[PDB]
Structure 1
Amino acid sequence: GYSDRVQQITLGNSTITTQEAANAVVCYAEWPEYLPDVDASDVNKTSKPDTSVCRFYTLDSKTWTTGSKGWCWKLPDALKDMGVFGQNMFFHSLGRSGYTVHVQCNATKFHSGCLLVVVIPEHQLASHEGGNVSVKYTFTHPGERGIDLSSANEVGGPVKDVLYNMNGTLLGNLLIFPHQFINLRTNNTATIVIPYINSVPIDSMTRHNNVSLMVIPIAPLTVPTGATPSLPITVTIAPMCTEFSGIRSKSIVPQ
């Protein structure tokens, strides 16, 4: 009696269960793996903390209301302060990792709503100022909090129009990227396994965000008559096949 709906994911000393899943997506059908010799350039022996960093970290919950526009997190940024994973991030010159993203949101058979959960490799954001204005470091490194698409523009920050994916492309085409939907009537969780995707073997984990995770309401939230007009959304992420290289002083980053 095994179902696409019931699943368990165990990484390190952390386990996740869901009784209302919709299968799981493995980006471009590729499971994360360590860096093979044939592709390596950096000559340093790498460090593989394994279970101390390859475990689930739960971010702060977001509140989905009738007016929510969506949220955007960036990796590895979002976990920059998570236990040993975070520490290794700043103590090493280079690093590479994959992840298992698990977005949670339950309601009742009376509610309705549909969230789009998508992973976008190299999600280079646009400046709301147009022209040739840049987007300052801090604004693409929100950390665990993430970027709230319904928040107002701010000097040095990115444009936050859900309709244009924060980058001049249409929302409807976000589906070309590995994604999954959390359709309250069907779902309650979305799971995406992300393999390391980059044009280099390994890379700086502080100055470059490999992918960004977006949770975007498409069909708006609807609650039954007289019910609390909101639902919480929780994001849990676990790094996997994490490798660190070039250990040293420990970066000091903007702000």
Structure 2
Amino acid sequence: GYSDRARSITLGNSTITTQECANVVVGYGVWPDYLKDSEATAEDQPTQPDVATCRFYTLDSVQWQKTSPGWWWKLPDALSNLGLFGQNMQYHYLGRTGYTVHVQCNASKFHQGCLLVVCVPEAEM
């Protein structure tokens, strides 16, 4: 049999494994797909890098202290300088993409705490 805690995610040449995880949250009920012809506007032919751009990029780690207010990341800017994703978004004028965010924090059975992870669309500050 299998459990709901264990879950592996494969993308490109990257595999993420977890043995203690909650159910995956899929957006607003929608799975990221490609732009259709009855919804497009730009006439020329687009380029899909696929494996070179759709893979797991890890960022720097931050330390969780006993007095940490919290952190945030502007998703498109965060990867603007990583691999071929940044290069394709640097040589082109228009782009379109969805995301898969995995946040990881491990501690023992004698630690306590609770972190809220939220993907906020159009967070104007």
Compare the two structures and name the one with the higher strand fraction.
Answer: 1
Show structure 2 runs of 5+ residues with no match.
Answer: none
RMSD of Structure 2 on Structure 1 (CA)? 0.7
d(CA) in 2 for partners of 1:75 and 1:103?
13
Question: TM-score under structure 1 normalisation?
Answer: 0.48
Show structure 1 runs of 5+ residues with no match.
Answer: 126-255
In structure 2, the partner of 1:115 is: 115
Amino acid at match of 2:54: C
d(CA) in 2 for partners of 1:43 and 1:3?
47
d(CA) in 2 for partners of 1:65 and 1:90?
36
In structure 1, the partner of 2:26 is: 26
For the pair shown, the structure with the greater C-alpha radius of gyration is: 1
Measured against aligned partners, the alpha-carbon deviations of 1:72-131 in whole angstroms (never above 9, x if no partner) come to 001211101110000111110000001110000000111011000000011111xxxxxx
Percent identical among aligned pairs is: 64
In structure 1, the partner of 2:55 is: 55
Superposition map of 1:1-255 within 5 A: 1-125=1-125
Amino acid at match of 1:103: V
SS of the residue aligned with 1:10? strand
Question: TM-score under structure 2 normalisation?
Answer: 0.98
Give the total of aligned pairs. 125
Deviation at 1:13, TM superposition (A): 0.2
d(CA) in 2 for partners of 1:44 and 1:8?
37
Amino acid at match of 2:38: V
d(CA) in 2 for partners of 1:88 and 1:123?
25
SS of the residue aligned with 2:78? helix
Measured against aligned partners, the alpha-carbon deviations of 1:11-35 in whole angstroms (never above 9, x if no partner) come to 0000100001001100101110000
Deviation at 1:3, TM superposition (A): 2.1
d(CA) in 2 for partners of 1:69 and 1:4?
31
Deviation at 1:4, TM superposition (A): 2.0
d(CA) in 2 for partners of 1:76 and 1:44?
23
